[PDB]
Structure formats: structure tokens, C-alpha cells
Amino acid sequence: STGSATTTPIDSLDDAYITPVQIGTPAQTLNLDFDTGSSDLWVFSSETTASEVDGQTIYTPSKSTTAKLLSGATWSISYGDGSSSSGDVYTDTVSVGGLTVTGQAVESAKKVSSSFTEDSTIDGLLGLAFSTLNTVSPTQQKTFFDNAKASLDSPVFTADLGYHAPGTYNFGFIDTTAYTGSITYTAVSTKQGFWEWTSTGYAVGSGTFKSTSIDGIADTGTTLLYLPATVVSAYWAQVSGAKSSSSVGGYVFPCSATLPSFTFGVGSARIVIPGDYIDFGPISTGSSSCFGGIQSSAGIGINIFGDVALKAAFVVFNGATTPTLGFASK
Ligand SMILES: NCc1ccc(C(F)(F)F)cc1
Numbered sequence: 001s002t003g004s005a006t007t008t009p010i011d012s013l014d015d016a017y018i019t020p021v022q023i024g025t026p027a028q029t030l031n032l033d034f035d036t037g038s039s040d041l042w043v044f045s046s047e048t049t050a051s052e053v054d055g056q057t058i059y060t061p062s063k064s065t066t067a068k069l070l071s072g073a074t075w076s077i078s079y080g081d082g083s084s085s086s087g088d089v090y091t092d093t094v095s096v097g098g099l100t101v102t103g104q105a106v107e108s109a110k111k112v113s114s115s116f117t118e119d120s121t122i123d124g125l126l127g128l129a130f131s132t133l134n135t136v137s138p139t140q141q142k143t144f145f146d147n148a149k150a151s152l153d154s155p156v157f158t159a160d161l162g163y164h165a166p167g168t169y170n171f172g173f174i175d176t177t178a179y180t181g182s183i184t185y186t187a188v189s190t191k192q193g194f195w196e197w198t199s200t201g202y203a204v205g206s207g208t209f210k211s212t213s214i215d216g217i218a219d220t221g222t223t224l225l226y227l228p229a230t231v232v233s234a235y236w237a238q239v240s241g242a243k244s245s246s247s248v249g250g251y252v253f254p255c256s257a258t259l260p261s262f263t264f265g266v267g268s269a270r271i272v273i274p275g276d277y278i279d280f281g282p283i284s285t286g287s288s289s290c291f292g293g294i295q296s297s298a299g300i301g302i303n304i305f306g307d308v309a310l311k312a313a314f315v316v317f318n319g320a321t322t323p324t325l326g327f328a329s330k
């Protein structure tokens with residue numbers, strides 16, 4: 001079997017991407033943020049603290065004939081940006097673009113942090129990292145991808161994120177019409193539960209390619225590109241007026257500047273991020289200082305190939321027994 005669903009940016013900056021997901025019987029359609037950096041499927045629900053819901057669509061397990069409370073199970077998660085949420089667990093039928101999984105753990109949020117409440121367009125998250133990161137206690141639960149793996153034609157899913165445009169998540173097959181050239185596959189380490197790979201280097205604009213190993217994670221749930229300080233300083237040194245701002249919390253640049261592209265290495269292949277992808281607009285309404293899409297990972301502890309990098313490529317998440325990551329130009 002296979003599945004295919006359209007993913008849509010939530011705003012004009014591509015801050016996140018939402019994908020419609022059917023939960024329950026009859027179907028309750030929620031727009032979820034597909035997050036390859038986490039492994040919990042959690043949703044706003046009828047159980048969420050009422051003051052913490054502001055425009056989201058909520059899952060109502062009491063109206064689903066297939067919903068079963070997972071007795072005694074709780075969950076609590078904290079994301080690298082300080083966001084958090086917690087609640088209890090149900091099992092229910094979950095379908096993505098025609099691909100159906102019965103008995104999927106659907107984690108009902110009782111408490112959500114402020115950043116989720118203020119994001120009215122995101123009804124929840126669908127984690128696509130490895131199941132070892134799932135926070136359900138005392139019985140860890142599998143991800144949607146892990147539960148569907150056996151019935152998929154091929155144990156893969158692909159991410160084709162659009163630049164200011166809709167994109168596609170595909171489960172079970174590689175669309176050979178969606179990319180140009182060949183797919184370059186690179187080895188993945190699962191030791192931390194992430195889609196963790198090693199980039200072979202980088203280049204700034206038309207500059208010389210620097211062969212150097214950059215260890216990082218493919219994370220659709222992270223907006224920006226987070227790279228080591230040496231690399232990020234080398235990029236922003238090529239933008240006139242660019243500087244690191246402690247008050248803003250990152251590199252900013254004059255909104256009138258033109259940004260160079262950024263190239264990162266996948267094996268012997270190259271993925272080029274257009275400079276326009278690195279522009280995230282004014283730091284405040286009316287400001288002439290603009291926020292950069294490439295930031296330092298020094299404070300994070302891990303390099304993150306977020307949406308800024310991934311939307312420049314066709315990306316294959318190969319969940320075979322030896323998992324691999326595939327990158328193609330598009
Ligand atoms: N997109 C989920 C996510 C968020 C943060 C991190 C961090 F900060 F731990 F790297 C990993 C994954």
C-alpha cells in the first residue's frame with residue numbers, strides 16, 4: 001500500500017508545514033506538522049485546557065467509534081525550542097493520504113505550552129523520527145511510519161517541501177517524476193533516535209567548496225538551518241552589513257541586501273539552497289533589518305538541517321533495516 005498527501009506552508013515565511021490527517025471513525029481531519037525530529041503523534045483535543053486552545057481543530061475521542069483509551073499511559077515532551085506538551089493516550093484509526101493504520105497511538109494533549117496555543121494553524125504534530133524517542137510511559141509506542149512499514153510497498157517516505165508553495169509527503173514509493181538527476185544516498189546513524197547523517201562540506205555562493213564533515217539531523221520540524229559557528233560566520237561574512245545580534249538572537253542583515261546561495265554536500269553530490277530561501281523577512285513589522293535563515297548551532301548541541309535546507313531537495317527517508325537518507329535536486 002501507499003499514501004500521498006499535500007503539505008502546505010502555514011504562512012508567508014514557510015515557518016512550518018501542515019498536512020491533513022484523518023483520525024477516528026467517522027474521520028476527524030486535523031492539520032498536523034510532520035516532524036522527522038520527534039516521534040510522538042499528539043493533537044489538540046477535547047481534553048486540552050480550554051484557555052490553552054485558540055482556533056485549533058480538536059480531536060474528540062468520545063465521538064470516534066474506534067477510539068480506545070490506553071489505560072494508565074501518559075506522555076510528556078519537550079522540544080529543543082523550549083516548547084512542551086503533555087496528556088494521555090488513545091488508540092484510533094489514522095489515515096494519511098489514503099494510507100491507513102489501525103490502533104495508532106494518538107496522544108491527547110491535556111496541557112500545551114504558549115507557543116502551540118498561539119499557532120492557530122497547527123492542530124498537532126506527527127513524529128517521524130525513530131520510535132526509541134517516543135515519550136509514552138510506561139509502554140513506549142510506535143510512530144505512524146513504524147506501524148505502516150510492513151504494509152507499505154517500500155519502507156520509505158519522501159519529503160518534497162515547497163518554497164512559498166505546497167509540497168508533498170509520500171509514503172511507500174519514490175516519485176521519479178518529482179526530482180532531477182539521481183538520488184544520492186548517505187548512511188544514517190540511529191544511535192540518538194534521529195535521522196542523523198554526515199554532510200561532506202559546503203560552499204558559499206560561487207566560492208570554493210570546503211570538504212569538511214558536518215554531522216547533523218534531517219528535521220522537517222525545524223524551520224531554519226543550524227550549522228557550526230565557523231560555517232555560519234563564513235556565510236554571513238559575504239553579506240554586507242550582516243551581523244550577529246544578541247538582542248535579536250541570531251544573525252540579521254539589511255533587508256536591501258541580496259543573499260548568496262548555500263551549497264551543502266551529500267556524498268559527492270551537491271544541494272544548492274538559493275539565497276532567497278535564506279531570507280526570513282524583517283525582525284519586526286516595519287523594520288529594515290531582516291532575519292537570516294542560517295544560524296549557529298553552538299547553543300543547540302547538534303546541527304539541524306531544517307526546512308531551509310530540506311525544501312531545496314527531494315528527500316528520501318529510507319526506513320529499511322539499515323536506514324539511509326536520499327537527496328536529489330529538483
Ligand atoms: N523537530 C523536533 C526537534 C526539535 C529540537 C531538536 C534538538 F534541539 F534537540 F536538536 C531535535 C528535534
Ligand SMILES: NCc1ccc(C(F)(F)F)cc1
Pocket residue numbers: 016033035037038079080081083115116119122221222
Ligand atoms: N520542532 C518541533 C516543533 C514544531 C513547531 C513548534 C511551534 F511552532 F509550534 F512552536 C514547536 C516545536
